[PDB]
Each structure stands twice: as structure tokens, then as C-alpha cells.
Amino acid sequence: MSLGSESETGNAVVVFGYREAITKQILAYFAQFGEILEDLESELGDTETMRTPGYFFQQAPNRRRISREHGRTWTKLTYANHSSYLRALREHGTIYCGAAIGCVPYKHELISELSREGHHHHHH
């Protein structure tokens, strides 16, 4: 593998248990840190909540909205900062739309499992 040792990314989490019908709503909360899904129209008219470790969000409308690889029901959110990582981690009784969302630390084996149920690409 590209990475060595036995650890994770550390500043990236795997979020699963969401649907593309809650993007406008759920994204608004986490928007402080970054974006989650691809369907986003008019996001934070003012302030922009000084989100992203780059002040502004770098993504092109001619490509995928999210530059991170996302699956059917899971996405890899990388904030580069541990503070955002831990805050977005939640998993402390966080129930959204009637179901608890799963924000876990990056695990390679988990991705393989996720891609099995949430088949999206070959090899990936």
C-alpha cells in the first residue's frame, strides 16, 4: 500500500448512514468544516462560516462536486485539521432524521466492506 505502519489518516473520517435527500439540511451543520454530498445550491450566502482549511472550497462544476471518493451511502471527509476531525466525528448519540449516523475513523478494511454493499467502481 501507499501508506505504511498500522494507522489511519488521522484527519479524515468515514461518514455513512445518510441519504441524498438530506444534503441541504445535514450539510448546513457540517458546512462549518466542509461539504458532504454533491447536491448543493446556494450555500451560506453570507459569512461562509470561514469553512475549509483553505478559506474557500476548491471544487469544479465541470467535475464531481466532491473531490473525495464517495460511495452509495458513505463518504470520506478530509478536513486536514484534527479539531474538525474530532468535532465532525460525533458518534455520541447523534441521531439524524430518526437514525444515528456513523462517523468513524478511516479504516481500509471498512472501505472494502462499504464498496461491497455500496458497489460503485471496480478496484475502488
Short mmCIF file of C-alpha atoms in Angstrom, two decimals:
data_model
loop_
_atom_site.label_atom_id
_atom_site.label_comp_id
_atom_site.label_asym_id
_atom_site.label_seq_id
_atom_site.Cartn_x
_atom_site.Cartn_y
_atom_site.Cartn_z
CA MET A 1 0.00 0.00 0.00
CA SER A 2 0.97 3.65 -0.39
CA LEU A 3 0.86 4.20 3.38
CA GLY A 4 2.91 2.34 5.97
CA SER A 5 2.61 1.27 9.62
CA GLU A 6 -0.79 0.40 11.09
CA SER A 7 -2.76 3.55 11.48
CA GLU A 8 -5.25 5.68 9.70
CA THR A 9 -5.34 9.04 8.05
CA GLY A 10 -5.91 10.76 11.37
CA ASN A 11 -7.50 13.86 9.84
CA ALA A 12 -10.13 12.12 7.73
CA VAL A 13 -13.31 10.31 8.70
CA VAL A 14 -15.72 7.96 7.00
CA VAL A 15 -19.29 9.12 7.24
CA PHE A 16 -22.09 6.72 6.46
CA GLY A 17 -25.81 6.44 7.09
CA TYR A 18 -27.09 9.41 5.11
CA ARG A 19 -29.23 9.91 2.01
CA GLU A 20 -29.07 12.43 -0.88
CA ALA A 21 -32.42 13.79 0.29
CA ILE A 22 -30.92 15.46 3.38
CA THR A 23 -27.97 17.27 1.78
CA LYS A 24 -29.32 20.78 2.10
CA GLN A 25 -30.10 20.15 5.75
CA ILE A 26 -27.21 17.99 7.05
CA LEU A 27 -24.56 19.80 5.01
CA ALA A 28 -25.50 23.13 6.59
CA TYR A 29 -24.39 21.88 10.03
CA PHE A 30 -21.12 20.29 8.87
CA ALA A 31 -20.56 23.09 6.39
CA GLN A 32 -18.59 24.76 9.16
CA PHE A 33 -15.95 22.17 8.48
CA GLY A 34 -16.64 21.17 4.86
CA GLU A 35 -19.15 19.70 2.39
CA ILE A 36 -20.62 16.18 2.36
CA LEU A 37 -22.77 15.46 -0.72
CA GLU A 38 -22.75 16.80 -4.30
CA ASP A 39 -26.20 18.40 -4.49
CA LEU A 40 -25.76 21.91 -3.20
CA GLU A 41 -27.42 25.08 -4.43
CA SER A 42 -26.66 28.44 -2.74
CA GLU A 43 -24.58 27.56 0.28
CA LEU A 44 -24.02 30.08 3.01
CA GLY A 45 -24.95 33.40 1.40
CA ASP A 46 -23.00 35.39 3.94
CA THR A 47 -20.07 34.68 6.20
CA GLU A 48 -19.41 31.29 4.54
CA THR A 49 -18.63 30.35 8.17
CA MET A 50 -14.88 30.58 7.28
CA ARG A 51 -15.14 26.89 6.40
CA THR A 52 -12.38 24.71 4.86
CA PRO A 53 -8.64 24.87 5.89
CA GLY A 54 -8.17 26.93 2.75
CA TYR A 55 -10.76 29.67 3.47
CA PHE A 56 -12.57 28.72 0.28
CA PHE A 57 -13.82 25.46 -1.16
CA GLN A 58 -11.93 24.23 -4.21
CA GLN A 59 -14.16 22.18 -6.49
CA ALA A 60 -15.15 22.46 -10.13
CA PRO A 61 -18.74 22.42 -11.53
CA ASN A 62 -17.36 20.60 -14.59
CA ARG A 63 -16.37 17.65 -12.40
CA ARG A 64 -17.51 15.84 -9.30
CA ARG A 65 -18.60 18.26 -6.61
CA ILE A 66 -16.68 16.34 -4.02
CA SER A 67 -13.05 15.65 -4.84
CA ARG A 68 -13.02 12.93 -2.22
CA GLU A 69 -14.24 9.46 -3.11
CA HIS A 70 -17.82 8.85 -2.10
CA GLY A 71 -19.93 5.74 -2.24
CA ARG A 72 -23.63 4.95 -2.17
CA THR A 73 -24.14 5.76 1.47
CA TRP A 74 -20.65 6.73 2.66
CA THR A 75 -18.13 9.49 2.05
CA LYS A 76 -14.54 10.17 3.11
CA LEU A 77 -14.39 13.60 4.64
CA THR A 78 -10.92 15.03 5.00
CA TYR A 79 -10.56 18.26 6.98
CA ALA A 80 -6.73 18.20 7.36
CA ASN A 81 -7.26 19.52 10.89
CA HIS A 82 -7.68 17.27 13.91
CA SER A 83 -10.07 19.74 15.54
CA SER A 84 -12.57 19.44 12.69
CA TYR A 85 -11.95 15.70 12.59
CA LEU A 86 -12.92 15.17 16.20
CA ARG A 87 -15.88 17.59 16.12
CA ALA A 88 -17.32 16.00 12.97
CA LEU A 89 -16.63 12.57 14.46
CA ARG A 90 -19.66 12.87 16.78
CA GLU A 91 -20.89 9.27 17.34
CA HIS A 92 -22.04 10.41 20.82
CA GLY A 93 -25.74 9.79 20.40
CA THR A 94 -26.14 11.67 17.19
CA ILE A 95 -29.49 10.82 15.63
CA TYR A 96 -30.38 12.48 12.40
CA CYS A 97 -33.77 12.12 10.66
CA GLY A 98 -34.61 9.26 13.02
CA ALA A 99 -31.41 7.29 12.51
CA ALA A 100 -27.97 7.51 14.04
CA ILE A 101 -25.28 8.46 11.57
CA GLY A 102 -21.98 6.66 11.60
CA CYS A 103 -18.86 8.77 11.56
CA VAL A 104 -15.89 6.52 12.10
CA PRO A 105 -12.09 6.84 11.75
CA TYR A 106 -10.63 5.93 8.38
CA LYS A 107 -10.27 2.17 8.01
CA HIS A 108 -9.05 0.48 4.85
CA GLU A 109 -10.92 -2.77 5.51
CA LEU A 110 -14.10 -0.82 6.15
CA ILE A 111 -13.82 0.76 2.70
CA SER A 112 -13.61 -2.68 1.12
CA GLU A 113 -16.73 -3.72 3.06
CA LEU A 114 -18.52 -0.48 2.17
CA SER A 115 -17.71 -0.89 -1.52
CA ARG A 116 -19.21 -4.41 -1.42
CA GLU A 117 -22.70 -3.28 -0.39
CA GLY A 118 -22.24 0.08 -1.92
CA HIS A 119 -20.70 -1.08 -5.16
CA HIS A 120 -19.71 1.93 -7.23
CA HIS A 121 -16.46 1.15 -9.05
CA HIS A 122 -14.20 -1.75 -9.87
CA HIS A 123 -10.93 -1.95 -7.88
CA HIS A 124 -12.10 1.06 -5.84
#
